[PDB]
Amino acid sequence: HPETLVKVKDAEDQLGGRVGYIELDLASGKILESFRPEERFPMMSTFKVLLCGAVLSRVDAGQEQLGRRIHYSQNDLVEYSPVTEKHLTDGMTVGELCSAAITMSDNTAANLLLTTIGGPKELTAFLHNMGDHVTRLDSWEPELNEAIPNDERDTTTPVAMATTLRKLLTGELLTAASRQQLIDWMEADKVAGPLLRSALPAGWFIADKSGAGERGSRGIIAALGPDGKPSRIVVIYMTGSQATMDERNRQIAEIGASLIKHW
Numbered sequence: 001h002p003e004t005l006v007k008v009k010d011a012e013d014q015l016g017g018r019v020g021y022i023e024l025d026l027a028s029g030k031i032l033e034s035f036r037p038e039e040r041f042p043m044m045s046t047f048k049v050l051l052c053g054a055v056l057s058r059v060d061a062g063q064e065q066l067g068r069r070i071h072y073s074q075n076d077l078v079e080y081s082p083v084t085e086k087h088l089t090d091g092m093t094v095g096e097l098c099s100a101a102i103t104m105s106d107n108t109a110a111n112l113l114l115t116t117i118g119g120p121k122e123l124t125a126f127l128h129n130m131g132d133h134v135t136r137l138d139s140w141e142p143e144l145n146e147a148i149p150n151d152e153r154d155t156t157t158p159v160a161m162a163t164t165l166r167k168l169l170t171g172e173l174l175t176a177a178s179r180q181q182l183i184d185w186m187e188a189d190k191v192a193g194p195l196l197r198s199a200l201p202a203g204w205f206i207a208d209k210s211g212a213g214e215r216g217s218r219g220i221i222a223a224l225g226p227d228g229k230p231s232r233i234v235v236i237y238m239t240g241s242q243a244t245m246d247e248r249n250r251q252i253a254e255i256g257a258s259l260i261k262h263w
């Protein structure tokens with residue numbers, strides 16, 4: 001029931017740490033509402049979307065194919081690889097790898113895709129090449145997750161992430177088929193149910209990616225809107241508190257209810 005900015009500031013009051021929030025109009029790119037928009041937060045697994053953006057960029061350029069099959073071994077597996085650990089004999093295609101990285105937050109799938117483009121510093125270069133000189137990836141999985149403060153490593157700001165997400169989803173940086181593929185993976189997200197999804201009314205569209213980390217970190221990037229079609233981008237990050245997972249999740253779901261009731 002409180003207005004969205006009030007609820008965001010309330011969430012920070014209750015949790016400690018910092019909460020960062022932006023709501024952007026997808027068609028116009030106008031900032032509709034913000035809180036700590038230019039401050040840095042850890043990205044956590046929300047970078048997996050930007051990673052698959054870079055893959056699809058290579059596909060549109062003729063340097064990659066989504067059906068290319070990648071084989072790997074048990075020695076490649078890292079913590080939290082629920083899809084990739086099931087495909088040791090058959091491997092996965094590049095397209096399956098993006099689906100696993102986005103929809104299940106598979107860490108081996110992300111690492112494998114980062115190998116295809118030459119590592120974290122190459123993802124950062126792709127972002128620079130599209131006009132985002134703020135967001136940076138420095139680490140491989142699973143060692144994003146870990147003790148965060150700060151540095152600037154593996155961080156973005158709400159306005160940078162949102163702007164960069166809008167460029168990927170609606171710009172002419174990717175072909176129409178690649179833009180639709182990226183949004184299809186986000187729509188099929190399986191691991192974000194307690195977050196914005198828990199507040200969404202019947203018949204709304206949502207395409208999202210969540211993140212979680214140490215030092216009270218949690219976040220979500222999402223494109224959503226009524227009647228089957230996305231119309232706004234919403235970015236929420238939090239970090240720096242001693243809050244439990246259940247506490248973090250609840251605050252994001254309450255921010256979500258506010259945003260919906262005041263649409």
Ligand SMILES: [Ca+2]
Nearest residue numbers: 009012013018
């Ligand atoms: Ca405050």
